[PDB]
Design a protein around this motif. Structure first.
Motif, mmCIF file in Angstrom:
data_model
loop_
_atom_site.group_PDB
_atom_site.id
_atom_site.type_symbol
_atom_site.label_atom_id
_atom_site.label_comp_id
_atom_site.label_asym_id
_atom_site.label_seq_id
_atom_site.Cartn_x
_atom_site.Cartn_y
_atom_site.Cartn_z
ATOM 1 N N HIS C 3 36.309 36.083 45.757
ATOM 2 C CA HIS C 3 36.432 37.427 46.326
ATOM 3 C C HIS C 3 35.991 38.484 45.305
ATOM 4 O O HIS C 3 36.192 38.311 44.099
ATOM 5 C CB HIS C 3 37.863 37.688 46.809
ATOM 6 C CG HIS C 3 37.979 38.861 47.730
ATOM 7 N ND1 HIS C 3 38.115 40.153 47.272
ATOM 8 C CD2 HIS C 3 37.961 38.943 49.084
ATOM 9 C CE1 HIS C 3 38.187 40.979 48.301
ATOM 10 N NE2 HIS C 3 38.101 40.271 49.413
ATOM 11 N N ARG C 4 35.362 39.553 45.798
ATOM 12 C CA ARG C 4 34.894 40.678 44.967
ATOM 13 C C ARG C 4 35.084 41.995 45.738
ATOM 14 O O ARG C 4 34.696 42.071 46.915
ATOM 15 C CB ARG C 4 33.401 40.516 44.628
ATOM 16 C CG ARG C 4 33.051 39.334 43.733
ATOM 17 C CD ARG C 4 33.345 39.618 42.268
ATOM 18 N NE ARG C 4 32.278 40.401 41.645
ATOM 19 C CZ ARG C 4 32.171 40.648 40.339
ATOM 20 N NH1 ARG C 4 33.067 40.178 39.469
ATOM 21 N NH2 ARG C 4 31.153 41.378 39.893
ATOM 22 N N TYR C 5 35.680 43.013 45.095
ATOM 23 C CA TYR C 5 35.722 44.385 45.651
ATOM 24 C C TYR C 5 34.524 45.188 45.147
ATOM 25 O O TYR C 5 34.104 45.022 43.997
ATOM 26 C CB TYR C 5 37.046 45.089 45.310
ATOM 27 C CG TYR C 5 38.195 44.567 46.145
ATOM 28 C CD1 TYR C 5 38.227 44.792 47.523
ATOM 29 C CD2 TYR C 5 39.233 43.821 45.576
ATOM 30 C CE1 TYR C 5 39.257 44.305 48.308
ATOM 31 C CE2 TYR C 5 40.269 43.327 46.360
ATOM 32 C CZ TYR C 5 40.270 43.576 47.723
ATOM 33 O OH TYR C 5 41.263 43.094 48.527
ATOM 34 N N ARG C 6 33.959 46.036 46.009
ATOM 35 C CA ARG C 6 32.805 46.859 45.618
ATOM 36 C C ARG C 6 33.207 47.921 44.579
ATOM 37 O O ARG C 6 34.387 48.301 44.498
ATOM 38 C CB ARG C 6 32.136 47.527 46.828
ATOM 39 C CG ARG C 6 31.219 46.593 47.614
ATOM 40 C CD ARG C 6 31.257 46.830 49.122
ATOM 41 N NE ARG C 6 30.213 47.708 49.658
ATOM 42 C CZ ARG C 6 30.074 48.016 50.952
ATOM 43 N NH1 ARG C 6 30.913 47.523 51.874
ATOM 44 N NH2 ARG C 6 29.089 48.823 51.336
ATOM 45 N N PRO C 7 32.232 48.381 43.763
ATOM 46 C CA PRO C 7 32.502 49.454 42.808
ATOM 47 C C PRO C 7 32.996 50.712 43.512
ATOM 48 O O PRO C 7 32.306 51.234 44.395
ATOM 49 C CB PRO C 7 31.140 49.696 42.138
ATOM 50 C CG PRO C 7 30.400 48.418 42.300
ATOM 51 C CD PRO C 7 30.892 47.791 43.573
ATOM 52 N N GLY C 8 34.196 51.156 43.127
ATOM 53 C CA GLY C 8 34.871 52.309 43.727
ATOM 54 C C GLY C 8 36.139 51.962 44.494
ATOM 55 O O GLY C 8 37.019 52.818 44.650
ATOM 56 N N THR C 9 36.242 50.718 44.965
ATOM 57 C CA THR C 9 37.316 50.327 45.872
ATOM 58 C C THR C 9 38.653 50.211 45.151
ATOM 59 O O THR C 9 39.690 50.626 45.686
ATOM 60 C CB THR C 9 37.030 48.979 46.565
ATOM 61 O OG1 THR C 9 35.630 48.840 46.833
ATOM 62 C CG2 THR C 9 37.813 48.875 47.876
#
Ligand SMILES: [Ca+2]
Lengths: 100, 80, 99, 105, 99, 80
Positions: C3-9
């Motif tokens: 899993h990865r969250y986008r930059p800013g999230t």
DNA sequence: GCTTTTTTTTTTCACAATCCCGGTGCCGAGGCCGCTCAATTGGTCGTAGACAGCTCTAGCACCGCTTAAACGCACGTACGGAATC
């Protein structure tokens, strides 16, 4: 001439003049410029006095001494201005005490 | 080395989060340290003056409170 | 499936979290030593009530948080989302902190 | 009788200042050294502005200080500008200062 | 050919002129009527010392001149040369004048 | 009457020039009148307050100097 | 290589605006004057704060354990800033 003296209105202007002739003897000063020098002296009187009033009040003292004025001055003026103003105030107290 | 570096990048990031910032240049962390040091300089200078004036070698909370009031940043809850 | 969250999230999650909380965000000891370090430059062998150093921190943190809010608007005003040193500088210029 | 000003080597009125302190609701009591100290500080500051305001006049080829001259003097000195940062000097005008990016190339 | 300065050249002249000078730049009468007009909202049939109106003017113009400095910095900060309402508004928001 | 228009476009441009402004949006002029009005309302309200407390029917310059000092906008040269 | 073509670059060249000068004449800075009011001098009483001497608060030094936060680093997406229109 005309009756009723106009009611007294204190100013510092004779002392601004006197300091002016030490510093720049061949230099005068306009009407409104003197109004500014007055407004200035009164501003800084108020600031210094008020802070000394507080200093005295914080440390539970009834009496504003030359000590309070110095501390207030150290709090209020910037660096070089405070040093000189501290020197001159010290000089003035020293000189006054010894001339009793 | 400098205690100023003890204010870390992660602490700085948290502060700017609380102030609603989303994205932060790398340069800010020094810049912030600059500002913060100047802030403390100014507030502590005046507090210690109150201390030196009280003839104490211990800076009270009240010393800081009076220093913070003078600097226009009145502070509630610490013996105001 | 890592899993990865986008930059800013996560930033957006952190904002939300920290705005909701009131606890001081600088580590207290490194702060205390910085207060003591700077205090030396005016007077040596100075003692600090713990509450005095806490006032100073509560103070330091409120001012900086506040400055970040003002800085953030300066960034946005220049059609950016990233705060930069010049944003802080304009802010303090307009606040009347620096010349 | 000679004035407290003359004892203290001052131009500013130590007696007047001492009364203002007594009559201005600052404390219940006032030390003798206080008004001497204060008067001296107000005179110093005054002298420091008049020195600098005179220079601005002389540089304008004028004999008498005006509001502009004070303003120039004050804002061109980092320390005075700080001291009087929240003060407006009437008929002072502003320092000539055009931002570099607005100038032609 | 009829002579013409390029857009920007007289704007700079006007700057140099007014920054050199100290005279009030709002016309004294329209200002005085405005002072009297606003003052009615609070109390009717009010007189004014002449110096009180001059004081009020000296103060207005120093405020606004100053505000235009801050505003001009906010326009520059967004890589613009033209001041806009949002520049004034941001300046004022930072100064604390407005929420 | 309706005097806020008496703060003309050119007079606003003049102030802006003294403030170092080179280029000025068409929307600035009404925006400035708003600010100027807000500024005056606040200063005058306190002035008038001082006048009323002194039981007078004429605003003095002191009323205005004292009001201006109350707004953190000290003015020198009108008896301040 | 060199000719042709082309933009730069650079110089002339008018013209508006801003700066200095002396000449003029008017008005408030400046100083003198005579009175008044606030400062000084020289009394006395009273206490406010300096001082010593004591208590005991809380501010500092220091240790050892448990994590939790700080720190690098591998990785790539989304921003910033440049350019053109
Ligand atoms: Ca006692």
């Amino acid at each position: 001439g005309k009756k009723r003296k106009r009611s007294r209105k204190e100013s510092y202007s004779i002392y601004v003049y006197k300091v002016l002739k030490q510093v720049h003897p061949d230099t005068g000063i306009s009407s409104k410029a003197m109004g500014i020098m007055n407004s200035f002296v009164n501003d800084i009187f108020e600031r210094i006095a008020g802070e000394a009033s507080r200093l005295a009040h914080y440390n539970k003292r009834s009496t504003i001494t030359s000590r309070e004025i110095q501390t207030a001055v150290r709090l209020l003026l910037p660096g070089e201005l405070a040093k000189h103003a501290v020197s001159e105030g010290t000089k003035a107290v020293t000189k006054y005490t010894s001339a009793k | 080395r400098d205690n100023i570096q003890g204010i870390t990048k992660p602490a700085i990031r948290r502060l700017a989060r609380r102030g609603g910032v989303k994205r932060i240049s790398g340069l800010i962390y020094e810049e912030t340290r600059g500002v913060l040091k100047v802030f403390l300089e100014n507030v502590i200078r005046d507090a210690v003056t109150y201390t030196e004036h009280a003839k104490r070698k211990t800076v009270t909370a009240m010393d800081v409170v009076y220093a913070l009031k003078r600097q226009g940043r009145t502070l509630y809850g610490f013996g105001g | 499936k890592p899993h990865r969250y986008r930059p800013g999230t996560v930033a957006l999650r952190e904002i939300r979290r920290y705005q909701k909380s009131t606890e001081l965000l600088i580590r207290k000891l490194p702060f205390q030593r910085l207060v003591r370090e700077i205090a030396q430059d005016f007077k040596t062998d100075l003692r600090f009530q713990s509450s005095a150093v806490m006032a100073l921190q509560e103070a330091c943190e409120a001012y900086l948080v506040g400055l970040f809010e003002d800085t953030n608007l300066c960034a946005i005003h220049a059609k950016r989302v990233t705060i930069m040193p010049k944003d802080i500088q304009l802010a303090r210029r307009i606040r009347g902190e620096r010349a | 009788a000679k004035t407290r000003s003359s004892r203290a080597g001052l131009q500013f009125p130590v007696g007047r200042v001492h009364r203002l302190l007594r009559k201005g609701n600052y404390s219940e009591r006032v030390g003798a050294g206080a008004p001497v100290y204060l008067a001296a500080v107000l005179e110093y500051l005054t002298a420091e502005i008049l020195e600098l305001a005179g220079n601005a006049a002389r540089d304008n080829k004028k004999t008498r200080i005006i509001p502009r001259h004070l303003q120039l003097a004050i804002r061109n000195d980092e320390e005075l500008n700080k001291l009087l940062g929240r003060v407006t000097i009437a008929q002072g005008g502003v320092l000539p200062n055009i931002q570099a990016v607005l100038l032609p190339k």
